[model samples]
Target: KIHAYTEGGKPLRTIYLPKLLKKVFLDVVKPNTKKNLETCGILCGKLRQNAFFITHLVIPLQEATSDTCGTTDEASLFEFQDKHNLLTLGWIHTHPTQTCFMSSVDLHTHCSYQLMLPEAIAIVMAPSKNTSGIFRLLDPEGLQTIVKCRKPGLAHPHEGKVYTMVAQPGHVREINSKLQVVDLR
Candidate 1:
């Protein structure tokens, strides 16, 4: 009965994020941001030394708006991951005109991800504010609430902070590493 993950009773695994992943995500979405459109990418990697290392950023085809980016073409995303023997570590998306924080949809979006891997994270890129965020659900409560809620889009309000920022001394550790981007758009 771990609080950070619904299935186990231990701390979440540490994730080694490539410092370049953020840089490239911003650069790749530069045009979209200028047009007030958002973009998204998937973080795929491998597990080693009881830690996850993000080595690839899969830019999946998606529908985007100034505030939301929905990934499309699931088969391609899975194929890429399978081919590379990579794990679905997390996901990243841009908020072209807003501040960095997970919206109700974002919270729900990450619930399944966190379930898939306790260490799964959601990276939000807020180019307009020159800022970004690394986050995950608050387990137990956050996880249970989202799983039970039936409302869709502008979903019903839940109790307290259902999510939190992942920072230093946390489950996420940004490090220098070579990363590859496979644009499947």
Candidate 2:
């Protein structure tokens, strides 16, 4: 229960994001979003300067509904990442008509990611509100809590504030770095 935000309780460096990720993702998911369906992309990157730099945004072939997005043919995604030597940084998805936040299913999705990489993030794009958000579950609360639950759906009850914004002072930051978009869809 101690230092749950670190990998093996070791120190973690801040994640560097590209300034254009927001625009690039919106463009990538434009087609599905227009029909009010959800679309998702995986954030991949490298480790440098003792920090993580998100260098690639990958769009995998996926199925979606009004509030759900699931990628298929994930083997291709794995092959691509292997070829490029990319680490799974996090994920991004659109809410279409919902607000900027983590849905229950999204929380579980992020929990798995965070479990593997403590710095993993969930980017929520809510064009209906003309807004976006970057989030992660709180340690020993959202992280500890959600990691044990198996409830389903886009909505559910959770005790207390289960997540926190990465738009904070120390969580994440955008830099003027080159960002490549890979569409495997």
TM-score versus the correct structure, for each prediction: 0.91, 0.90
The lowest-lDDT stretch of 10 consecutive residues in candidate 1 is: 1-10
Give, for candidate 2, the lowest lDDT window spanning 10 residues. 1-10
Clashing pairs in 1: none
The alpha-carbon RMSD values of the candidates against the true structure, listed in the order shown, are 3.1, 3.4
Give the Cα lDDT of each candidate.
0.83, 0.85
The per-residue C-alpha lDDT of model 1 at residue 175 equals: 87
Mind giving the per-residue lDDT tens digits that candidate 1 earns over 124-162? 988889999998887777788788878755645776768
Candidate 1 lands at a TM-score of 0.91
Runs of candidate 2 exceeding 4 Å displacement: 1-11, 152-154
Candidate with best lDDT:
2
TM-score of 2: 0.90
